[PDB]
Amino acid sequence: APHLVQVDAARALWPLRRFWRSTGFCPPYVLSWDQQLNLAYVGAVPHRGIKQVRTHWLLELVTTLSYNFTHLDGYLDLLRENQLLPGFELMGSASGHFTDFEDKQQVFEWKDLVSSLARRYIGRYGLAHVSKWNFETWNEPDHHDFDNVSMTMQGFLNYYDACSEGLRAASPALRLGGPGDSFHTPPRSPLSWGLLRHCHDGTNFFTGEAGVRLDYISLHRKGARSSISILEQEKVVAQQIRQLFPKFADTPIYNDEADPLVGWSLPQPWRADVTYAAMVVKVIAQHQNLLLANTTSAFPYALLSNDNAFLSYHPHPFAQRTLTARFQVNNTRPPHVQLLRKPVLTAMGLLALLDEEQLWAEVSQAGTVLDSNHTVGVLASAHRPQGPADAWRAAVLIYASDDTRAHPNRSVAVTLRLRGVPPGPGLVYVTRYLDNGLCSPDGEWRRLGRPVFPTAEQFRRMRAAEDPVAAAPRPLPAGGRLTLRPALRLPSLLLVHVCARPEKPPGQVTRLRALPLTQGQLVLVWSDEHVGSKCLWTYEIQFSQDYTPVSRKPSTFNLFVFSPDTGAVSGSYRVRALDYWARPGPFSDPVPYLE
Ligand SMILES: *[C@@H]1O[C@H](CO)[C@@H](O[C@@H]2O[C@H](CO)[C@@H](O[C@@H]3O[C@H](CO[C@H]4O[C@H](CO)[C@@H](O)[C@H](O)[C@@H]4O)[C@@H](O)[C@H](O[C@H]4O[C@H](CO)[C@@H](O)[C@H](O)[C@@H]4O)[C@@H]3O)[C@H](O)[C@H]2NC(C)=O)[C@H](O)[C@H]1NC(C)=O
Ligand SMILES: *[C@@H]1O[C@H](CO)[C@@H](O[C@@H]2O[C@H](CO)[C@@H](O)[C@H](O)[C@H]2NC(C)=O)[C@H](O)[C@H]1NC(C)=O
Ligand SMILES: *[C@@H]1O[C@H](CO)[C@@H](O)[C@H](O)[C@H]1NC(C)=O
Ligand SMILES: *[C@H]1O[C@@H](C(=O)O)[C@@H](O)[C@H](O)[C@H]1F
Ligand SMILES: [Cl-]
């Protein structure tokens, strides 16, 4: 019996916040051409789809009393150029200087370093920007990952106070949280539990005042291949914090490594394709629907981060927990690195289209109501018109996902009944579909026979599988109703996008950049910040040598790899948006390129 998915576009229940717009990684590097490409891919997720990059060991990018900030400046500029913020973990020894946080002198020095770096980047980017940064404590303090630094219980509290008093010294507007660990039942996790007691009831290292600032509480909970287990584990912890620390009952909780399975480098076939993509979407749906959908317990859960910005290595280009697939092509003159968009990265661009209010939704099978704790589920959103640039939007994201297990033979029959769409001018809809047969770069890589150093043409075919299957805009049926009975694969993802026609056309594409890969091969990347409407069909790219359109299958990801047969890449490039009504926006500033 089929699954019935019902959506009411007239019932905007509560706000829908995009709490999942984060990623992260750990160095083994951060300034290599590889990472430059990686963060361009991350940054290219449309409509600020990924906003934060939680990066380990940022204070090893500073050397030593004065400090050389050159490398840290490097990484942060790279983030800033890709429209990304750092998950700023105050993590490092400043290249050997710091060794003991029970040494009074060093605690004071840590405070002054924190103030220096904070003030430096406030000066570099503006306070309006640096306030948004989630400054965080050292990663997993209960997991002994300190190198040559002695971090005892007392030392951790001293360290935190230096962190907090240092950031305050820069500006009181700066945000700081922690501990960024798992919070196991005591006597376990003593520095995680110790921190909250310290902030709640302890005395500041510097002021002697009772209690210390703690702007958010971050935990790490993974699901060991189960999706709903993540959410189940968070509730146990959140509720324990609520009862043990009453002052933190409203304190935001982050899970800033909420991954399906611990151990990023462990090769997993499901990490390669839509199996991973759909599970991430399922996890997010579970968190919205079974935690933030005006529940009677309503914990202040504010951030979820899939820690998947790592670069993959040989011989597992797809099988690791990464957003991109890396190919180091060692047999060209000279050796060069290529990246492919994994289905999970494309999934983040689909989650990106969800707007500011959740609509009423219900999944049922033969009259039995099913919540997101099932193989099939939905997220739905509505948008309130802002200016003449945008209109009313509906985003309906349906997943089929059995967690880390895929089912190639199964065809999940789904019937979608959309109702109560507020009437308006030019009501059209567009579908975008993803599965392992149609949209798996990995699977194409395998049809090609697993080429270790893929040729240009092999990459072209491999990239063809990146984007979802899109259907051209069709007018909405009368009465603001739409019924569709698609057959879904397992895993699969389906976005239905219903848009009303805005008064003005799309805005101007901005911050266009050209990035070299190898001979006759280049990455074009851009920003959609001034386009000011999510109802977009494709981005038109034009090339002039002394302007003709570059013909390509429709895509709304803010990154394109230009690899023509001729090899003629030298010239000028311009880019503009094209909406669902074929109305073009103004072309971006031309970007010159020579080889
Ligand atoms: C084309 O050329 C590039 C260089 O430009 C080669 O890239 C190297 O590829 C190998 C992978 O095959 C890399 O070596 C592997 O690195 C992994 C990560 O290492 C870091 O992290 C660990 C733990 O945190 C540290 O021990 C280590 O010091 C690093 O900081 C390791 O996990 C791997 O070890 C595992 O696999 C090997 C098999 O090779 C086993 O022997 C081990 O027991 C273990 O299970 C591994 O060492 C290497 O880092 C890459 N270098 C660069 C610069 O990227 C490509 O390999 C080459 N292409 C081909 C086809 O040869
Ligand atoms: C999500 O669903 C799973 C299974 O559908 C639930 O796990 C079951 O819970 C009951 C009651 O606690 C146990 O007796 C069973 O052993 C569990 N079944 C299986 C197959 O593991 C789980 O409790 C649900 N969680 C939420 C948050 O809805
Ligand atoms: C800091 O270090 C960088 C890279 O190691 C080096 O090139 C530079 O000379 C140093 N800068 C200053 C201002 O000392
Ligand atoms: C949390 O867990 C690690 C892992 O799963 O391998 C990584 O995601 C991160 O470095 C760590 F913070
Ligand atoms: Cl994982």
Side-chain angles (χ1 to χ4, degrees):
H3 292 254
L4 170 60
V5 186
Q6 216 152 14
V7 181
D8 200 332
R11 283 178 76 189
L13 303 163
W14 30 77
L16 170 57
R17 297 184 194 93
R18 301 194 296 169
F19 59 82
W20 57 81
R21 302 183 293 124
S22 170
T23 188
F25 77 93
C26 182
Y29 165 80
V30 288
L31 285 193
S32 71
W33 186 244
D34 304 49
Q35 198 63 263
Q36 294 192 49
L37 282 168
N38 194 44
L39 297 168
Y41 272 76
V42 177
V45 182
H47 308 112
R48 306 299 303 263
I50 303 176
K51 195 181 166 198
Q52 172 194 253
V53 186
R54 196 186 172 258
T55 316
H56 285 45
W57 302 113
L58 287 170
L59 300 192
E60 292 295 348
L61 304 179
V62 196
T63 33
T64 313
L65 207 79
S66 62
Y67 298 108
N68 191 352
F69 292 109
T70 307
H71 289 135
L72 190 61
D73 275 296
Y75 181 70
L76 297 184
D77 281 354
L78 190 56
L79 284 175
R80 192 73 191 84
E81 196 175 21
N82 285 299
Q83 297 184 335
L84 292 165
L85 325 199
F88 213 112
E89 302 167 68
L90 297 167
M91 185 175 184
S93 62
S95 309
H97 175 75
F98 296 98
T99 66
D100 184 0
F101 284 99
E102 279 197 33
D103 176 24
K104 191 180 88 158
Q105 195 189 320
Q106 287 183 59
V107 187
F108 276 93
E109 282 161 353
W110 192 265
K111 172 168 166 286
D112 293 338
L113 172 62
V114 177
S115 179
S116 306
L117 79 88
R119 285 176 288 111
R120 175 159 184 81
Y121 299 114
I122 286 161
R124 203 169 181 83
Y125 308 118
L127 175 78
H129 186 84
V130 182
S131 298
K132 291 164 179 188
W133 296 11
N134 293 298
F135 290 93
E136 201 172 12
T137 54
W138 206 295
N139 192 65
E140 295 174 0
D142 283 305
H143 282 68
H144 298 85
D145 199 37
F146 288 118
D147 290 341
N148 293 307
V149 183
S150 171
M151 190 79 80
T152 62
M153 179 65 256
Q154 188 58 63
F156 186 56
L157 305 186
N158 304 354
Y159 155 84
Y160 184 82
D161 293 340
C163 287
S164 195
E165 289 298 307
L167 286 168
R168 183 173 172 79
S171 169
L174 297 179
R175 191 197 289 119
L176 171 70
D181 214 333
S182 49
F183 281 101
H184 292 299
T185 299
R188 303 177 72 197
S189 290
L191 277 68
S192 302
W193 295 116
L195 176 67
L196 301 185
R197 187 272 167 180
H198 168 76
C199 298
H200 199 275
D201 312 300
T203 57
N204 194 308
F205 188 87
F206 297 96
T207 70
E209 292 301 303
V212 177
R213 174 264 296 261
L214 183 76
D215 303 316
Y216 65 84
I217 300 162
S218 57
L219 52 79
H220 297 346
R221 284 306 177 119
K222 294 135 174 300
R225 294 188 185 80
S226 164
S227 75
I228 196 60
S229 176
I230 298 167
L231 171 43
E232 283 170 343
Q233 276 172 105
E234 290 161 333
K235 287 205 276 195
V236 167
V237 185
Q239 174 64 207
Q240 272 159 28
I241 282 161
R242 177 178 281 184
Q243 295 216 297
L244 191 58
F245 308 106
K247 295 190 223 162
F248 302 146
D250 289 288
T251 304
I253 294 167
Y254 294 18
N255 188 350
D256 53 25
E257 51 158 37
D259 305 292
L261 172 71
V262 67
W264 80 270
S265 60
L266 207 86
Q268 300 282 276
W270 51 268
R271 277 178 183 166
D273 51 27
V274 183
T275 312
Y276 184 39
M279 192 183 176
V280 164
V281 165
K282 172 177 200 175
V283 165
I284 289 154
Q286 287 174 337
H287 280 78
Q288 180 55 28
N289 297 331
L290 318 171
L291 202 70
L292 298 177
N294 214 358
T295 318
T296 56
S297 30
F299 299 104
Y301 190 87
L303 187 138
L304 187 146
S305 187
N306 288 262
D307 196 30
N308 61 6
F310 295 92
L311 288 162
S312 61
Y313 62 73
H314 177 86
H316 304 295
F318 288 90
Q320 291 164 324
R321 198 213 297 137
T322 68
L323 294 149
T324 52
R326 178 169 66 158
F327 286 103
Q328 298 153 301
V329 186
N330 299 0
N331 67 320
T332 53
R333 299 290 196 275
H336 76 269
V337 54
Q338 299 273 313
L339 296 189
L340 283 133
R341 210 212 297 163
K342 288 175 74 181
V344 72
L345 188 53
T346 307
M348 299 302 279
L350 293 184
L351 287 148
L353 286 160
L354 295 171
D355 290 303
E356 77 277 359
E357 289 165 353
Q358 185 169 21
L359 292 167
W360 180 86
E362 185 180 295
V363 181
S364 62
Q365 194 188 20
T368 312
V369 168
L370 308 160
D371 58 2
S372 302
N373 186 16
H374 287 82
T375 56
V376 187
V378 67
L379 255 180
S381 68
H383 177 63
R384 193 198 289 168
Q386 199 80 58
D390 64 341
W392 183 89
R393 298 198 281 269
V396 187
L397 186 57
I398 311 166
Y399 66 92
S401 164
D402 182 30
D403 289 4
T404 69
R405 293 166 304 278
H407 304 289
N409 204 34
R410 202 162 302 185
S411 184
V412 183
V414 165
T415 304
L416 172 79
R417 264 185 258 262
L418 178 66
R419 283 160 159 165
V421 175
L427 277 166
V428 293
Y429 73 98
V430 164
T431 59
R432 289 173 175 91
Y433 179 70
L434 281 173
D435 62 13
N436 283 340
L438 280 143
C439 308
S440 184
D442 168 77
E444 252 288 333
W445 179 60
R446 286 164 182 280
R447 281 188 284 278
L448 295 162
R450 284 161 51 208
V452 69
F453 302 145
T455 68
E457 181 61 35
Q458 297 178 319
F459 278 122
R460 294 184 181 92
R461 289 184 66 189
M462 264 179 279
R463 289 187 171 106
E466 288 176 334
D467 291 302
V469 182
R474 289 182 55 79
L476 195 72
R481 324 206 170 209
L482 181 61
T483 308
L484 295 163
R485 296 175 191 89
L488 304 181
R489 223 69 207 149
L490 188 55
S492 55
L493 291 163
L494 178 70
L495 192 111
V496 180
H497 203 221
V498 189
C499 295
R501 183 178 62 240
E503 196 190 25
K504 291 281 171 184
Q508 194 206 5
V509 183
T510 53
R511 323 228 306 172
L512 184 63
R513 292 190 294 140
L515 303 166
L517 292 173
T518 183
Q519 185 272 298
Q521 231 171 308
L522 130 134
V523 171
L524 288 164
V525 69
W526 56 86
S527 174
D528 58 0
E529 63 182 1
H530 298 119
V531 182
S533 192
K534 286 186 183 174
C535 57
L536 300 169
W537 176 241
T538 196
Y539 283 98
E540 184 171 353
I541 306 180
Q542 292 195 339
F543 182 49
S544 181
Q545 310 213 221
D546 295 296
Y547 283 101
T548 58
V550 178
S551 189
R552 66 185 190 120
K553 53 99 162 292
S555 172
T556 47
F557 212 83
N558 301 341
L559 191 143
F560 174 73
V561 178
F562 190 43
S563 182
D565 272 57
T566 57
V569 291
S570 304
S572 288
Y573 300 94
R574 58 185 192 174
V575 180
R576 72 180 172 182
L578 195 73
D579 68 15
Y580 295 148
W581 302 265
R583 311 181 303 170
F587 275 112
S588 65
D589 282 344
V591 163
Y593 191 63
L594 54 87
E595 202 176 45

